[PDB]
Amino acid sequence: NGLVFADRTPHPALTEAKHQQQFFQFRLSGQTIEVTSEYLFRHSDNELLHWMVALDGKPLASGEVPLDVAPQGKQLIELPELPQPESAGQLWLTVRVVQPNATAWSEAGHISAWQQWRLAENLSVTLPAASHAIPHLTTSEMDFCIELGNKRWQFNRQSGFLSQMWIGDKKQLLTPLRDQFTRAPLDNDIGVDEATRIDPNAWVERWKAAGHYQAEAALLQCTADTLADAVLITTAHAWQHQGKTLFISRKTYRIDGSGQMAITVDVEVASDTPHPARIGLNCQLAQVAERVNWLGLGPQENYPDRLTAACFDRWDLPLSDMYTPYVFPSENGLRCGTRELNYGPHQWRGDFQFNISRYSQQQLMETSHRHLLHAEEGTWLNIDGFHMGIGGDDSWSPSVSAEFQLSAGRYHYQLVWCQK
Amino acid sequence: GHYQAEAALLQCTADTLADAVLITTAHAWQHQGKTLFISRKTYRIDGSGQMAITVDVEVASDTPHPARIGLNCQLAQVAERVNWLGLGPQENYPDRLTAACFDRWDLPLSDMYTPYVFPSENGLRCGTRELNYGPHQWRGDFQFNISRYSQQQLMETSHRHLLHAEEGTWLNIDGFHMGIGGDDSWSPSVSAEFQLSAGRYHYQLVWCQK
Ligand code: NA
Ligand code: NA
């Protein structure tokens, strides 16, 4: 149940605890930062505030101000006039409290606190430059095919899913892109303190009994249309278990002359089915790259009810860091609030949560120990419009608070897939 | 600049499909060089006569959260009854709807207006899946109000006895509507979970003739 592994390597949860247990609080009013000390005895005599303003990860301005706060006291820091850019995006302010000097318990340059705020946002009004190229649709009995030069997109008309993508003669997918509504259960979803308890109230059990893990997709609609400058595929799927419809998924895929595939997803969830762990898509990619790079919350694993410690910026990590090696395997390594994701030739833009690794949700839920996991061929990608909270208040009864359960009934998310 | 914000057209294409016409639009509401909202829509008129409207709105994170995200128009028809599947029968709002029940409700048009002495937004009904008015039917998941008074006349007139019924019927269909609040009435009282702060919004509507 540790914040650390037996060898004292941090679990991702530790960083959330560090952030929430901060000894300095911050408010932002206009250009003023108010820093309040939660110490009771010490003045801030080994602390400096670093501030940084960035546009979608791009550093615009930064600075340093010494901290001189009495225990329980306040210091107002006035920011210099910020040299606003004209280009579209969201400006983010980040502050960090840094300890310049080593102590008996920390190294020089130790970070004790941080915080972020959204500053100005400039919405993108300027149209994209109209591409000259135009995609073409090749219909067969079994498939819709879209080609754009080297690029090729294949929609299986029997299943209703994007079954394959081609760059010239190279395959991009090892498994089709399908809706996913389940996760490999966390310890908080399993809910039991004792071994032989088959607790009928736990999330995994409610999910198992409703047939979430074994629901079969049934195709309702799979049509293709040609527009002036794009091809539009439209699909509708029903997930059923024992005649009962749990989820309906309605999708458009819009492929334009730029080679961008725009996916719209609208999901209905039956109000009497237990709230799903996630509402997303997954596929097994053929590529295995070294680095994952994203504009979103990071660097560490973060979930909707555990993301306060994560900062929004441009993060770049090795693939292996995008997996969390919990001894008992589960859904893991998610990052939330992501606007852009980069992996090998692929780029996904939108507002989504994702995890990426060499292990399928299936392998993760079938394996009892982490050392028994084996890297699957290619890379498993889950991209979620929505993900349920993880809970934790205890680990033997449902603990995901109401506001983090997927209860809306109707959900919408949109993704742009392109090959940069 | 929310009240004086002017719609600027970005896109307006038409496309013929196998069994439908697809109109795609984009707009930006600006005030003094600042982009407040972007609205992206598709209209799909198919062979059965139904028009499906899909709306996706962006709100700048640094503009005050808007009062509503919706559509309005003035219908030519003045009918006797309003029939809806949703929350009712009385006026209800996102942070004042626990008393309302989900059912099929049928009231005279006049009942769809609440005569507050100082006129304001009024008569909203939430959680509506189907709205019927004369030959018109709207389906989806929306909030609406319907009356002879425009949002403009309501905000310009100071007493209820000075209001005149306009020509036809003003319809407001909202995908999202701000809470009313009221913990007090001299400071912002709308709780955070009832402010339209998501940044991106989505609703869909089917309009047909029954
Ligand atoms: Na100091
Ligand atoms: Na008024």
From Swiss-Prot, chain B:
The record marks 186 as: Important for ensuring that an appropriate proportion of lactose is converted to allolactose. Induction: By allolactose. Substrate binds at residue 186. Homotetramer. Belongs to the glycosyl hydrolase 2 family. This is Beta-galactosidase. It comes from Escherichia coli (strain K12). The chain holds residues 815 to 1024 of 1024 of the full protein.
